[PDB]
CSV table of C-alpha atoms in Angstrom, one decimal:
chain,number,residue,atom,x,y,z
A,1,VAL,CA,-26.1,-30.4,-18.8
A,2,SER,CA,-22.7,-31.8,-19.3
A,3,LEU,CA,-19.8,-29.7,-18.8
A,4,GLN,CA,-18.7,-29.2,-22.4
A,5,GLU,CA,-22.0,-28.0,-23.8
A,6,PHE,CA,-22.6,-26.0,-20.5
A,7,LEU,CA,-19.4,-24.3,-21.2
A,8,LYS,CA,-20.7,-22.8,-24.8
A,9,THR,CA,-23.1,-20.4,-23.3
A,10,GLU,CA,-20.5,-18.5,-21.4
A,11,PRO,CA,-20.5,-18.6,-17.5
A,12,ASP,CA,-21.9,-15.5,-16.0
A,13,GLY,CA,-18.7,-15.2,-13.7
A,14,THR,CA,-15.4,-16.8,-12.9
A,15,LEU,CA,-14.4,-20.4,-14.2
A,16,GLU,CA,-13.2,-21.7,-10.6
A,17,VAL,CA,-16.8,-22.2,-9.3
A,18,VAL,CA,-17.8,-24.2,-12.9
A,19,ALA,CA,-15.0,-26.5,-11.6
A,20,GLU,CA,-17.0,-27.1,-8.1
A,21,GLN,CA,-20.3,-27.6,-9.6
A,22,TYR,CA,-18.9,-30.5,-11.7
A,23,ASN,CA,-16.6,-32.2,-9.1
A,24,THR,CA,-13.7,-31.3,-11.6
A,25,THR,CA,-10.6,-29.1,-11.6
A,26,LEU,CA,-10.2,-25.9,-13.0
A,27,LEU,CA,-8.0,-27.4,-15.8
A,28,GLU,CA,-11.1,-29.9,-16.9
A,29,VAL,CA,-13.1,-26.8,-17.2
A,30,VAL,CA,-10.6,-25.0,-19.4
A,31,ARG,CA,-10.1,-28.0,-21.8
A,32,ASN,CA,-13.7,-27.9,-22.5
A,33,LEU,CA,-13.9,-24.2,-23.1
A,34,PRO,CA,-14.8,-23.3,-26.6
A,35,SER,CA,-11.5,-21.3,-27.3
A,36,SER,CA,-8.7,-22.8,-25.4
A,37,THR,CA,-5.3,-24.2,-26.0
A,38,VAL,CA,-3.6,-26.3,-23.4
A,39,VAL,CA,-0.1,-27.7,-23.6
A,40,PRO,CA,2.3,-29.5,-21.1
A,41,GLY,CA,4.1,-27.5,-18.5
A,42,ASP,CA,7.4,-28.2,-20.3
A,43,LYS,CA,6.3,-25.3,-22.3
A,44,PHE,CA,7.0,-22.9,-19.5
A,45,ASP,CA,10.2,-21.1,-21.2
A,46,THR,CA,8.4,-20.6,-24.4
A,47,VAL,CA,5.8,-19.2,-22.9
A,48,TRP,CA,7.4,-17.1,-20.4
A,49,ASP,CA,10.2,-15.8,-22.6
A,50,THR,CA,7.4,-14.9,-25.3
A,51,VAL,CA,5.1,-12.9,-22.9
A,52,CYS,CA,8.7,-10.9,-21.7
A,53,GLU,CA,8.2,-9.1,-25.2
A,54,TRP,CA,4.5,-8.2,-25.1
A,55,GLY,CA,4.8,-5.1,-23.0
A,56,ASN,CA,2.4,-4.3,-19.8
A,57,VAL,CA,0.8,-7.2,-18.8
A,58,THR,CA,-1.0,-8.2,-15.4
A,59,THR,CA,0.7,-10.9,-13.3
A,60,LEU,CA,-1.9,-12.1,-10.9
A,61,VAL,CA,-1.4,-14.7,-7.9
A,62,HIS,CA,-4.4,-15.9,-6.1
A,63,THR,CA,-4.8,-17.0,-2.2
A,64,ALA,CA,-7.6,-17.9,0.1
A,65,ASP,CA,-7.1,-14.4,1.5
A,66,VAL,CA,-5.0,-12.2,-1.0
A,67,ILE,CA,-5.1,-11.2,-4.7
A,68,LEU,CA,-2.2,-9.2,-5.4
A,69,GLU,CA,-1.6,-8.4,-9.3
A,70,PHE,CA,1.1,-6.6,-11.0
A,71,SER,CA,0.8,-4.4,-14.1
A,72,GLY,CA,4.2,-3.9,-16.0
A,73,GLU,CA,6.3,-6.0,-18.2
A,74,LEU,CA,6.9,-9.5,-17.4
A,75,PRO,CA,10.5,-9.9,-15.8
A,76,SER,CA,13.0,-12.6,-17.4
A,77,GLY,CA,14.1,-15.4,-15.1
A,78,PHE,CA,16.7,-18.1,-14.7
A,79,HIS,CA,16.5,-21.8,-13.8
A,80,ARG,CA,18.5,-22.8,-10.5
A,81,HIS,CA,17.9,-25.8,-8.2
A,82,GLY,CA,14.2,-26.2,-9.4
A,83,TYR,CA,13.4,-22.4,-9.1
A,84,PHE,CA,12.6,-20.3,-11.9
A,85,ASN,CA,14.1,-17.1,-10.4
A,86,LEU,CA,12.8,-13.8,-11.7
A,87,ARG,CA,15.0,-10.8,-12.2
A,88,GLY,CA,14.1,-7.6,-10.8
A,89,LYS,CA,12.2,-5.5,-13.2
A,90,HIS,CA,10.3,-2.1,-12.3
A,91,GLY,CA,8.8,-3.8,-9.0
A,92,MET,CA,8.1,-7.2,-9.7
A,93,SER,CA,10.2,-10.2,-8.6
A,94,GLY,CA,10.2,-13.5,-6.8
A,95,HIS,CA,10.5,-17.3,-7.8
A,96,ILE,CA,8.3,-19.9,-9.4
A,97,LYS,CA,8.4,-23.4,-8.9
A,98,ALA,CA,8.3,-24.0,-12.6
A,99,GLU,CA,8.8,-27.8,-12.5
A,100,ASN,CA,5.5,-28.3,-10.8
A,101,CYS,CA,3.8,-26.2,-13.8
A,102,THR,CA,2.6,-29.5,-15.7
A,103,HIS,CA,0.2,-27.6,-18.1
A,104,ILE,CA,-0.5,-24.3,-19.3
A,105,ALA,CA,-3.4,-22.7,-21.1
A,106,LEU,CA,-4.3,-19.8,-23.3
A,107,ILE,CA,-7.6,-18.8,-22.8
A,108,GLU,CA,-9.9,-16.3,-24.5
A,109,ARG,CA,-13.4,-15.4,-23.2
A,110,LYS,CA,-16.0,-13.0,-22.2
A,111,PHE,CA,-16.1,-12.1,-18.4
A,112,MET,CA,-19.1,-10.1,-17.6
A,113,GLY,CA,-19.1,-8.7,-21.2
A,114,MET,CA,-15.6,-7.7,-21.4
A,115,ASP,CA,-13.0,-9.5,-23.9
A,116,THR,CA,-10.1,-11.5,-22.0
A,117,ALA,CA,-7.2,-13.1,-23.2
A,118,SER,CA,-5.4,-15.0,-20.3
A,119,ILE,CA,-2.5,-17.4,-19.7
A,120,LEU,CA,-3.1,-19.8,-16.9
A,121,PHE,CA,-0.4,-21.9,-15.4
A,122,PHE,CA,-1.6,-25.2,-13.9
A,123,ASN,CA,-0.1,-27.2,-10.8
A,124,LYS,CA,-0.4,-31.2,-10.5
A,125,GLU,CA,-3.8,-31.0,-8.9
A,126,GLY,CA,-5.2,-28.9,-11.9
A,127,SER,CA,-5.7,-25.8,-10.0
A,128,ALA,CA,-4.0,-22.5,-11.2
A,129,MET,CA,-0.6,-21.2,-9.5
A,130,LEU,CA,-0.2,-18.0,-11.6
A,131,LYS,CA,-2.3,-16.2,-14.1
A,132,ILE,CA,-1.1,-13.4,-16.7
A,133,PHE,CA,-3.9,-11.1,-18.3
A,134,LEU,CA,-3.5,-9.2,-21.3
A,135,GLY,CA,-3.0,-5.5,-20.8
A,136,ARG,CA,-5.8,-2.7,-21.6
A,137,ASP,CA,-6.0,0.8,-22.8
A,138,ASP,CA,-7.9,3.9,-20.9
A,139,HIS,CA,-11.1,2.9,-21.9
A,140,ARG,CA,-10.7,-0.7,-20.8
A,141,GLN,CA,-10.4,-2.4,-24.0
A,142,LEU,CA,-7.8,-5.0,-25.0
A,143,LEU,CA,-4.1,-3.8,-26.7
A,144,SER,CA,-5.0,-5.3,-29.8
A,145,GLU,CA,-1.1,-5.4,-30.5
A,146,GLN,CA,-0.8,-7.8,-27.7
A,147,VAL,CA,-4.0,-9.7,-28.8
A,148,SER,CA,-2.3,-10.4,-32.0
A,149,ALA,CA,0.9,-11.5,-30.4
A,150,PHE,CA,-1.0,-13.5,-28.0
A,151,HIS,CA,-2.7,-15.3,-31.3
A,152,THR,CA,0.5,-15.9,-33.0
A,153,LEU,CA,1.7,-17.7,-29.6
A,154,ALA,CA,-1.3,-19.7,-29.5
A,155,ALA,CA,-0.7,-20.7,-33.3
A,156,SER,CA,3.0,-21.9,-32.5
A,157,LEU,CA,1.8,-24.2,-29.7
A,158,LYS,CA,-1.1,-25.9,-30.7
A,159,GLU,CA,-4.4,-23.9,-31.3
B,1,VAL,CA,14.1,-27.9,24.4
B,2,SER,CA,10.7,-25.8,24.7
B,3,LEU,CA,10.2,-23.5,22.2
B,4,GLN,CA,10.6,-20.0,23.9
B,5,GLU,CA,14.0,-21.5,25.1
B,6,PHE,CA,14.8,-22.6,21.4
B,7,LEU,CA,14.2,-19.1,20.1
B,8,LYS,CA,16.6,-17.2,22.5
B,9,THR,CA,19.4,-18.0,20.2
B,10,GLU,CA,18.5,-17.3,16.5
B,11,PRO,CA,17.5,-20.3,14.2
B,12,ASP,CA,19.5,-20.7,11.3
B,13,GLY,CA,16.8,-20.2,8.8
B,14,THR,CA,13.3,-19.1,8.2
B,15,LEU,CA,10.5,-19.1,11.2
B,16,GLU,CA,8.0,-21.5,9.3
B,17,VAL,CA,11.0,-24.2,9.5
B,18,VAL,CA,10.8,-23.8,13.1
B,19,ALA,CA,6.8,-24.0,13.2
B,20,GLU,CA,7.3,-27.0,10.9
B,21,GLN,CA,10.2,-28.6,13.3
B,22,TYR,CA,7.9,-27.9,16.3
B,23,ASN,CA,4.3,-28.9,14.7
B,24,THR,CA,2.8,-25.7,15.7
B,25,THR,CA,1.9,-22.3,14.2
B,26,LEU,CA,3.9,-19.5,12.6
B,27,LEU,CA,2.1,-17.2,15.0
B,28,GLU,CA,2.7,-19.2,17.9
B,29,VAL,CA,6.4,-19.2,16.9
B,30,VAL,CA,6.5,-15.3,16.3
B,31,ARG,CA,4.9,-14.6,19.8
B,32,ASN,CA,8.0,-16.5,21.3
B,33,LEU,CA,10.7,-14.5,19.6
B,34,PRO,CA,13.0,-12.3,21.4
B,35,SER,CA,12.0,-9.1,19.6
B,36,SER,CA,8.4,-9.2,18.4
B,37,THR,CA,5.2,-7.1,18.9
B,38,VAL,CA,1.8,-8.9,18.1
B,39,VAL,CA,-1.4,-6.9,18.0
B,40,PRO,CA,-5.0,-7.6,16.7
B,41,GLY,CA,-6.1,-7.7,13.3
B,42,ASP,CA,-8.1,-4.7,14.0
B,43,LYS,CA,-5.1,-2.6,13.9
B,44,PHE,CA,-5.0,-3.3,10.1
B,45,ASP,CA,-5.8,0.3,8.9
B,46,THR,CA,-3.2,1.7,11.2
B,47,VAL,CA,-0.4,-0.6,10.1
B,48,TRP,CA,-1.1,-0.2,6.3
B,49,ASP,CA,-2.0,3.3,6.2
B,50,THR,CA,1.6,4.2,8.6
B,51,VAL,CA,3.3,1.6,5.7
B,52,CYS,CA,2.4,3.5,2.9
B,53,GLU,CA,4.4,6.5,4.1
B,54,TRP,CA,7.7,5.1,4.1
B,55,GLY,CA,8.8,4.8,0.9
B,56,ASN,CA,10.2,1.5,-1.0
B,57,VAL,CA,9.3,-1.8,0.5
B,58,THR,CA,8.8,-5.1,-0.4
B,59,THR,CA,5.5,-6.9,-0.5
B,60,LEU,CA,5.3,-10.7,-0.4
B,61,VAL,CA,3.0,-13.6,-1.1
B,62,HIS,CA,3.9,-17.1,-0.6
B,63,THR,CA,2.0,-19.9,-2.0
B,64,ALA,CA,2.8,-23.5,-2.2
B,65,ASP,CA,4.4,-22.9,-5.7
B,66,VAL,CA,5.0,-19.3,-6.3
B,67,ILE,CA,6.6,-16.5,-4.3
B,68,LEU,CA,6.0,-13.0,-5.4
B,69,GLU,CA,7.4,-9.8,-4.0
B,70,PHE,CA,6.9,-6.2,-5.4
B,71,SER,CA,9.4,-3.6,-4.4
B,72,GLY,CA,7.9,-0.2,-4.1
B,73,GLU,CA,5.8,2.4,-2.3
B,74,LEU,CA,2.9,0.4,-0.7
B,75,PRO,CA,-0.4,1.3,-2.2
B,76,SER,CA,-3.4,2.9,-0.4
B,77,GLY,CA,-6.7,1.1,-0.2
B,78,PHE,CA,-10.2,1.1,0.6
B,79,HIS,CA,-12.6,-1.3,2.4
B,80,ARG,CA,-15.9,-2.4,0.2
B,81,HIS,CA,-17.9,-5.7,1.0
B,82,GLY,CA,-15.3,-7.1,3.4
B,83,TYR,CA,-12.3,-6.6,0.6
B,84,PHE,CA,-9.4,-4.2,1.2
B,85,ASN,CA,-8.9,-3.0,-2.2
B,86,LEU,CA,-5.7,-1.3,-3.2
B,87,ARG,CA,-5.5,1.8,-5.3
B,88,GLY,CA,-2.3,0.4,-7.3
B,89,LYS,CA,-0.5,3.2,-8.6
B,90,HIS,CA,3.1,2.0,-9.7
B,91,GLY,CA,2.4,-1.7,-10.6
B,92,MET,CA,0.9,-3.6,-7.5
B,93,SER,CA,-2.7,-3.5,-7.1
B,94,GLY,CA,-5.3,-6.4,-6.0
B,95,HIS,CA,-7.4,-7.1,-2.9
B,96,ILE,CA,-7.0,-8.4,0.6
B,97,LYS,CA,-9.6,-10.0,2.9
B,98,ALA,CA,-8.6,-7.8,5.6
B,99,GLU,CA,-11.5,-9.0,8.0
B,100,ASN,CA,-9.7,-12.6,7.8
B,101,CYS,CA,-6.5,-10.8,9.3
B,102,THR,CA,-6.6,-11.7,12.8
B,103,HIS,CA,-3.2,-10.6,14.1
B,104,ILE,CA,-0.4,-8.5,13.0
B,105,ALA,CA,3.5,-8.7,14.2
B,106,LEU,CA,6.1,-6.6,13.7
B,107,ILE,CA,9.4,-8.4,14.1
B,108,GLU,CA,13.3,-7.7,14.1
B,109,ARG,CA,15.7,-10.7,13.8
B,110,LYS,CA,18.6,-11.7,12.0
B,111,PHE,CA,18.1,-14.0,8.7
B,112,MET,CA,21.4,-15.5,7.9
B,113,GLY,CA,23.3,-12.7,9.6
B,114,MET,CA,21.2,-10.2,7.8
B,115,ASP,CA,19.1,-7.7,9.9
B,116,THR,CA,15.5,-7.9,9.1
B,117,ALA,CA,12.5,-6.0,9.9
B,118,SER,CA,9.2,-7.2,8.8
B,119,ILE,CA,5.3,-6.9,9.5
B,120,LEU,CA,3.5,-10.5,8.9
B,121,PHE,CA,-0.5,-10.4,8.9
B,122,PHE,CA,-1.7,-13.5,9.9
B,123,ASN,CA,-5.1,-15.6,9.2
B,124,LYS,CA,-7.2,-16.9,11.9
B,125,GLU,CA,-5.1,-20.4,11.8
B,126,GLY,CA,-2.0,-18.4,12.7
B,127,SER,CA,-0.2,-18.6,9.4
B,128,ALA,CA,1.0,-15.6,7.3
B,129,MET,CA,-1.4,-14.4,4.8
B,130,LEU,CA,1.0,-11.5,3.5
B,131,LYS,CA,4.4,-10.0,4.3
B,132,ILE,CA,6.0,-6.5,4.0
B,133,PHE,CA,9.8,-6.3,4.4
B,134,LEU,CA,11.7,-3.3,4.8
B,135,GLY,CA,13.7,-1.9,2.1
B,136,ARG,CA,17.4,-1.9,1.7
B,137,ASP,CA,20.2,0.0,-0.1
B,138,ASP,CA,22.9,-1.1,-2.8
B,139,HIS,CA,25.0,-2.5,0.1
B,140,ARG,CA,22.0,-4.9,0.9
B,141,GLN,CA,21.8,-3.0,4.4
B,142,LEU,CA,18.4,-1.6,5.8
B,143,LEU,CA,17.4,1.9,5.1
B,144,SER,CA,17.9,3.4,8.8
B,145,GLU,CA,14.9,5.9,8.0
B,146,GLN,CA,12.5,3.1,7.6
B,147,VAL,CA,13.9,1.1,10.6
B,148,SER,CA,13.3,4.4,12.8
B,149,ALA,CA,9.7,4.7,11.3
B,150,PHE,CA,9.1,0.8,11.9
B,151,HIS,CA,10.6,1.5,15.7
B,152,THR,CA,8.0,4.3,15.7
B,153,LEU,CA,5.1,2.1,14.8
B,154,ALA,CA,6.0,-0.6,17.1
B,155,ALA,CA,6.4,1.9,20.1
B,156,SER,CA,2.7,3.1,19.1
B,157,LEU,CA,1.4,-0.3,18.7
B,158,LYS,CA,2.3,-0.9,22.1
B,159,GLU,CA,0.0,2.1,23.8
B,160,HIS,CA,-3.1,-0.2,23.6
């Protein structure tokens, strides 16, 4: 089966190993998803500044040996000398080489039966440099008000 | 000219640049610092559980394109199926492949004239998988109560 008709079931797990199995990038897998919106990285400020208004979200960084995730409001930031510098908001700060972000995707899919809505920031190799996931309530369901705002952003970008 | 001689006089920037400039690993640079304590990765639980008592610290992860840092209390965690899983309370959670941590270092040095005190967790290639830095006050000075606790941990790591 080719990649696009394969991603039309719903993979039993993460999108990263689908990319392996087809000798391709995470970005190429995301493009072939049933429900994804992919835009160039010059939409970074529009996407970032929009999510900053959504309330508590989860920001995630993945390395070979660590996953750190931060639940809370997305900090605002400013550009200086190639860096996007986060302003310290109740805990999380740091910097992003935002000009190395060449693509951004908004994704909706099931992950092990769980509705998910995420924003993926891609580097020039087609791999993820950062992920943001929508927040959840006490019964582990998405916050519908955030889902609505996410849908508004996807429509404004593309769809 | 040699690495240890070069480090006896405080480099003007980060320690990775020194390893870059010397074509070696960050761990080898850290070993040759004037003020460092290096222990094996089996001290992970002792180090982690100790820092969890220190108050607000800064935990940092560094990738090619992102640095994220979290200021606050270090979350406790539990081991399961090879992961150390954080019980994220006030924001930061996640998981660490702690059995891939082969060395831990406690470091004190000046960074651009600033006293700093850090804990570096190393992978088997001798590079950093995670960093924890001591907290600061509004004048950007270290919290001396944390520095004292850091010194207590370094002394205890030198028992074995």
